[PDB]
Amino acid sequence: VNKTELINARRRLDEEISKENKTPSSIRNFDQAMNRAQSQINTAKSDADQVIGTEFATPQQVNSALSKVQAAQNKINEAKALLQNKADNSQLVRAKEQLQQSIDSTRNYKNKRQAAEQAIQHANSVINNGDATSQQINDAKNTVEQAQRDYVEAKSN
């Protein structure tokens, strides 16, 4: 039997869904939907892994596992659809700075320094977790990069 489509669909279940530049509320919604779907996803992953590892798998077993994987992928895509892009505030930042010059930054700096320290602690926890998923690693990377961007901006005004 040709397992190509099942293998490819099974691998797609593990792909990172990017949270880069997504709103914090929409990320919460995504994580909440993924948790609701998690047992269905895990069962699809497990059944597909068994078929993939079956040396003499049948087309029926491949097709049944593929159907489960496709339904699990639809659940992931439903969760992904909750993610929303942040809106760009760069022109508002520049306008605010121009108004300030025409006429609390320390607290804001300290808040963003703390956010950077928390991002480093979160990254270390993920790095040290041998069970970490591609999604968890990528989420932590995006959090680190956002904390760096926010820190530089807060120390620069």
Numbering used by the authors: 6 to 108, 120 to 173
Q: Would you copy out the relevant sentences from the publication that reported this structure?
A:
Extracellular matrix binding protein (Embp) and its subdomains referred to as the F-repeat and the FG-repeat are critical for adherence of S. epidermidis to surface-immobilized Fn. Embp is a giant 1-MDa surface protein consisting of 10,203 amino acids (aa). High-resolution structure analysis of F- and FG-repeats revealed that both repeats are composed of two tightly connected triple α-helix bundles, exhibiting an elongated but rather rigid structural organization in solution. Both F- and FG-repeat possess Fn-binding capacity via interactions with type III subdomain FN12, involving residues within the C and F β-sheet.
A high-resolution crystal structure was obtained for the first F-repeat (corresponding to aa 2569 to 2738 of the full-length Embp). The F-repeat consists of two three-helix bundles and reveals an elongated shape approximately 70 Å in length and 30 Å in width and height. The N-terminal bundle is referred to as F-3H-N, and the C-terminal bundle as F-3H-C. Within F-3H-N, the first helix α1 (aa 2571 to 2584) and the second helix α2 (aa 2599 to 2623) are connected by an extended loop (aa 2585 to 2598). This loop (referred to as the Sandwich-loop [S-loop]) is involved in several stabilizing hydrogen bonds and van der Waals interactions between F-3H-N, a linear linker L2 and F-3H-C, potentially important for the structural integrity of the F-repeat as a compact unit. The analysis of the F-repeat surface characteristics reveals a prominent deep major groove as key structural feature. The wide groove shows an area of approximately 1,200 Å2 comprising a volume of 890 Å3 and is flanked by helix α2 (from F-3H-N) and helices α4, α5, and α6 (from F-3H-C). Compared to the FG-repeat, the crystal structure of the F-repeat reveals some similarities but also significant differences. Most importantly, the F-repeat misses a common long central helix, being relevant for structural integrity of the FG-repeat. Within the F-repeat, however, cohesion between α-helical bundles is supported by a so-called Sandwich-loop, a structural feature not described before. Based on the high-resolution structure, it appears that the F-repeat part of Embp is likely to be less tight and rigid than the FG-repeat containing region.
